[PDB]
Design a protein around this ligand. Structure first.
Ligand SMILES: [Ca+2]
Ligand SMILES: [Ca+2]
Length: 189
């Protein structure tokens, strides 16, 4: 089935981590990109938590997988991919494309406030809009770089009250005046 089932709530990141080695966010994420006039590949929502660093402090804000929705549009690599997909569904055939895979592996990732596109975005309450391959590879952010490797040409992070909405596409997409307001309605309240 579609990969949108493995994302929601299971403390999904833990699952993803060992596999790879407010609500419903999802429906709102789904509405967001379904409710849009550019071909977005996926939306993810990065949620805020707190860590407490060893041996010092530390009230450290951290962004982590909240949820996400994936619209969409070698053979060794592929066996590896389906294996982990079959694992993650298990805990707890059809081809696995680059964007699908990037979407899944994102479940394993987190960001110290101020660091990476999601952390920079949240720290400064910022919209960061990277459009075009050179925009991603020139960004100095390893997630943007990783996204570009997997075929993305647009990656966006928008700071919201509870976290950061991320949009990505394999197309070059300019910032729509309407798409920003939808993010307000769906993610701030
Ligand atoms: Ca969640
Ligand atoms: Ca490849």
């Amino acid at each position: 089935s579609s990969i949108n089932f493995l994302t929601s709530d299971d403390d999904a990141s833990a699952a993803a981590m060992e596999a790879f080695i407010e609500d419903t966010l999802q429906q709102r994420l789904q509405a967001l990109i379904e409710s849009a006039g550019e071909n977005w590949t996926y939306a993810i929502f990065w949620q805020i938590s707190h860590d407490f660093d060893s041996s010092t402090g530390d009230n450290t804000v951290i962004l982590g997988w909240g949820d996400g929705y994936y619209k969409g549009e070698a053979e060794q690599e592929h066996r590896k991919r389906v294996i982990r997909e079959l694992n993650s569904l298990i805990s707890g055939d059809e081809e696995v494309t680059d964007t699908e895979w990037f979407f899944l592996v994102s479940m394993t990732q987190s960001f110290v406030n101020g660091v990476g596109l999601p952390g920079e975005s949240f720290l400064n309450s910022r919209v960061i809009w990277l459009s075009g391959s050179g925009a991603l590879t020139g960004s100095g952010c390893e997630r943007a770089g990783q996204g570009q490797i997997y075929g993305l040409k647009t990656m966006v992070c928008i700071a919201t009250q509870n976290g950061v909405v991320e949009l990505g596409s394999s197309e070059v997409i300019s910032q729509s005046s309407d798409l920003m307001h939808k993010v307000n309605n769906l993610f701030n309240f």
